[PDB]
Design an enzyme around this catalytic site. Structure first.
Site, short mmCIF file in Angstrom:
data_model
loop_
_atom_site.label_atom_id
_atom_site.label_comp_id
_atom_site.label_asym_id
_atom_site.label_seq_id
_atom_site.Cartn_x
_atom_site.Cartn_y
_atom_site.Cartn_z
CB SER A 111 11.10 77.58 -9.27
OG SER A 111 11.79 78.37 -10.23
CG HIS A 164 12.54 75.02 -13.41
ND1 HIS A 164 11.30 75.41 -13.87
CD2 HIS A 164 12.87 75.90 -12.43
CE1 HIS A 164 10.90 76.47 -13.20
NE2 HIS A 164 11.83 76.79 -12.32
#
Ligand SMILES: CCCCCCCCCO[C@@H]1O[C@H](CO)[C@@H](O)[C@H](O)[C@H]1O
Ligand SMILES: CCCCCCCCCO[C@@H]1O[C@H](CO)[C@@H](O)[C@H](O)[C@H]1O
Ligand SMILES: CCCCCCCCCO[C@@H]1O[C@H](CO)[C@@H](O)[C@H](O)[C@H]1O
Ligand SMILES: CCCCCCCCCO[C@@H]1O[C@H](CO)[C@@H](O)[C@H](O)[C@H]1O
EC number: 3.4.21.105
Length: 180
Positions: A111, A164
């Protein structure tokens, strides 16, 4: 037209590790591939990267590999394997670093790398049209939905928002440089 070598090897590596995890269990595999979780492991260098090969659910690996296949495939095809390799190594390292700093060493998945590729592909297409790389208008919407899903914990992605953002920063930074 098929996925290039880097795009392909990464996908197969993730599937193999995912299988190993279903057979041996998540804990056993993390013991070997997780970011160093004890002083005794700080010099096992593969660990600063191998955390990205582990996924913890079907939806986790499914959507990570779909994005990687689309974005990573496009980058490798139009810009070369070398480009995908660097984006991948840097974003995996930085997102892994931020993740462990605030949440510990037990995490995994692509991710962070996907956030990097999303930022890279989108920005490169916005600032450098004739580069050939861009994020399809419609796909921007589903990318946002995927981002929102993780951001508000509607979809378990192992990594936290801070990690992220670190991955995204890498992609944007590299896109900025490449459009320079
Ligand atoms: C909503 C989930 C995210 C969108 C997923 C879209 C996947 C599109 C995959 O396309 C494939 O990409 C390869 C590499 O670029 C090409 O070699 C191949 O010909 C092409 O068919
Ligand atoms: C990592 C993926 C992040 C994607 C975030 C991109 C923001 C895009 C949403 O805004 C839209 O952008 C279009 C193109 O820039 C404009 O045409 C449109 O008017 C505007 O509403
Ligand atoms: C639950 C997630 C399901 C998402 C399904 C999305 C289907 C539409 C995606 O199309 C893909 O768009 C790419 C960019 O235009 C092309 O390069 C690629 O060849 C094409 O296959
Ligand atoms: C900007 C939003 C930052 O978000 C935070 O990022 C940290 C680092 O990952 C997480 O520990 C935390 O849960 C999350 O709220």
């Amino acid at each position: 037209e098929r996925a290039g070598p880097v795009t392909w090897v990464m996908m197969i590596a993730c599937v193999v590790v995912f299988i190993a995890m279903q057979i041996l269990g998540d804990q056993e595999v993390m013991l070997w591939l997780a970011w160093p979780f004890d002083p005794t492991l700080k010099f096992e260098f593969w660990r600063y990267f191998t955390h990205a090969l582990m996924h913890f659910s079907l939806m986790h690996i499914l959507f990570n590999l779909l994005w990687w296949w689309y974005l990573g495939g496009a980058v490798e095809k139009r810009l070369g394997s070398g480009k995908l390799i660097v984006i991948t190594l840097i974003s995996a390292l930085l997102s892994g670093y931020v993740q462990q700093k605030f949440s510990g060493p037990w995490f995994g998945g692509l991710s962070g790398v996907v956030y990097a590729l999303m930022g890279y592909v989108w920005l490169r297409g916005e600032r450098d049209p004739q580069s050939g790389i861009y994020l399809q208008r419609g796909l921007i919407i589903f990318a946002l939905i995927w981002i929102v899903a993780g951001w508000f914990d509607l979809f378990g992605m192992s990594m936290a928002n801070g990690a992220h953002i670190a991955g995204l920063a890498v992609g944007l930074a590299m896109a900025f440089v490449d459009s320079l």
